[model samples]
Target: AGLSFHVEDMTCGHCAGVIKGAIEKTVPGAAVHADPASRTVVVGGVSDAAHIAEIITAAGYTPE
Candidate 1:
């Protein structure tokens, strides 16, 4: 199933771009959609929220 994370600090389109790239790079065949307006990230074709959170953390964003 796909996963979604709440990232409060994802403040702009640039941040969304960065997180999307990072997650997609770390997880093959992953789809990333981020919205700064809602401060949410929706990822498809992946599981394991823990690993996803790690990827986000390493990308300089926090997932809650």
Candidate 2:
């Protein structure tokens, strides 16, 4: 249960870590595979991507 994200602003490992942490924080049992170099993110163990969007947002980034 993963979804795609095109976070254009993600350009650092820290950013990906932030997103990964945020996702795991908000979504139970969630796994994150983020690519800062490609400006993308992959998330697992979730029901709705809206949870991920919120994690991406407020967490300070875009996942669109």
Candidate 3:
């Protein structure tokens, strides 16, 4: 149960929704929370922080 990131592109509710959906698709049952102002995404249910970073990057954003 580990994984967290900050994304520079997460500047709105729509972006957060997109990231959440995209990550959940990659990792089933993953709990994702994002702070648009801070541009951060914290994920639970797995400890692959690198994988989470990659997933976030693949979503067309840098993990801030």
Candidate 4:
């Protein structure tokens, strides 16, 4: 399934890069798509939502 999180701190391309790296690192196959304008991140190939959220949070961004 796919997961979508609203991460308000995602305000730049660097934020998107960090989020993509963080999520992929935590969940190997997970694909991350972030839109700074919308403050949203969409992740695919995920089985554990909480874990993904934790990984994202650890990267210094809050996920809602």
List per-candidate RMSD values in Å.
1.6, 1.7, 2.0, 1.6
Encode model 4's per-residue lDDT on 1-64: one tens digit a residue. Answer: 5888888778888788888888888777788888878888898987578888888887887855
lDDT at position 1, candidate 1: 53
lDDT of 1 by residue, 1-64 (tens): 5788898778888779889999989889989989988888988876588888889877888854
Clashing pairs in 3: 6-64
Q: Write the per-residue lDDT of candidate 2 for residues 1-64, one digit (tens) a residue.
A: 4688889779999888888888888778887899999988887767577766877875697854
Count of residue pairs whose backbone atoms collide, per candidate: 0, 0, 1, 0
Candidate 1: residue 9 Cα off by (Å): 1.0
True-structure lDDT of candidate 4? 0.82
For candidate 4, which ten residues in a row score worst on lDDT?
55-64
The lDDT values for all models are 0.85, 0.81, 0.78, 0.82
Which of 1 and 3 is the better model by lDDT? 1
lDDT of 2: 0.81
TM-score of each: 0.87, 0.85, 0.80, 0.86
- Clashes in predicted model 4: 0
Once superposed on the true structure, which residue ranges of model 2 sit more than 4 Å away at CA?
A: none
- The reply for model 3, stretches above 4 Å from the true place, is none
